[PDB]
Design a protein around this ligand. Structure first.
Ligand SMILES: O=c1ccn([C@H]2CC(O)[C@@H](COP(=O)(O)OP(=O)(O)OP(=O)(O)O)O2)c(=O)[nH]1
Ligand SMILES: O=c1ccn([C@H]2CC(O)[C@@H](COP(=O)(O)OP(=O)(O)OP(=O)(O)O)O2)c(=O)[nH]1
Lengths: 115, 116, 116
């Protein structure tokens, strides 16, 4: 798969997703929502989409990653929407692992107004 | 796919899911959970289920979608289980986009007890 | 597929996923995140992975069910991670339905630096 940036890591065959990395250091206040930049651009194979889903490691810190859909056509850089549901401030360091990207098949069917 | 209603917009070949519009106005308080009607019913093809995932514009506001699994065997009105995990109350408007539905493939297996 | 435990129930061919039950009774103090044990091990068919999607009703009950990805190679016990987002202690009881597990396809490729 074609990519652009160093904010994503290869994965073993047994692994379902690629690790996404924070492009820069981030500080999330309590309850704050932030779109964290990864510095990566993707060229997803034709017929697939990328699912952004959290990693148990940062989830265990009171950080909820809000499910992200990466479209096949999307050509900008990937961003991870994250919320600090905890009651204190949290810091994500540069290049720290923050989420995963999973490539799933996509089915395109036109819509019909039947019954 | 056969659909009924107008709370779901068609999509492009480069798109992953079909947007889902709020059938009515919704006001969620901080930490409140409400199911949001879409007024859309549909027939999922054979061998596929429908996954409801939020759109980045609502996600970026602290709204998250809970249990968005639409079963192959389900013909009722689709409803979006939205929770406001932000620190303040937000209002979603009528016909405002609220989530996406991505048709994914079903994988049926029989569960067999055994050593793993 | 091969399972080892009691925390999982078979499904209808029209059902997208298998229900997960709470292994033991769990106390979640306010603002506490806890890996809810299920007591089941899996042997996911080759090429697939397991998607854990929280059960709507327990997200209303003041709990948030985090990142649920079971890798093809994972041979341990399945746990469901959750955070207590309310002002009171919430006790999850044994054999309580806490989530769903859906087997989905997985694409594997080498990452190549190019231009998009
Ligand atoms: O977690 C996410 C979600 C989205 N994106 C990007 C990539 C992608 O496919 C594109 C479009 O997201 P989308 O169209 O859902 O969100 P929107 O802001 O609600 O869009 P609009 O009304 O134009 O559909 O946004 C991310 O990087 N991360
Ligand atoms: O809801 C979940 C999420 C993960 N797991 C397990 C099973 C599985 O495939 C393995 C790995 O989780 P993961 O690798 O995401 O978390 P991490 O702690 O951040 O790991 P690392 O960077 O080493 O991968 O963790 C569960 O049982 N339930």
């Amino acid at each position: 798969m074609i990519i652009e940036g160093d904010g994503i890591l290869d994965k073993r065959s047994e692994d379902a997703g690629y690790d996404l990395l924070a492009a820069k250091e981030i500080h999330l206040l309590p309850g704050e929502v932030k779109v964290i930049p990864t510095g990566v651009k993707l060229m997803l194979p034709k017929g697939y989409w990328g699912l952004i889903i959290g990693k148990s490691s940062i989830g265990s810190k009171g950080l909820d990653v809000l499910g992200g859909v990466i479209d096949e056509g999307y050509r900008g850089e990937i961003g991870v929407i994250m919320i600090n549901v905890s009651r204190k401030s949290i810091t994500l360091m540069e290049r720290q692992k923050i989420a995963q990207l999973i490539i799933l098949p996509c089915k395109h069917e036109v819509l019909e107004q039947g019954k």
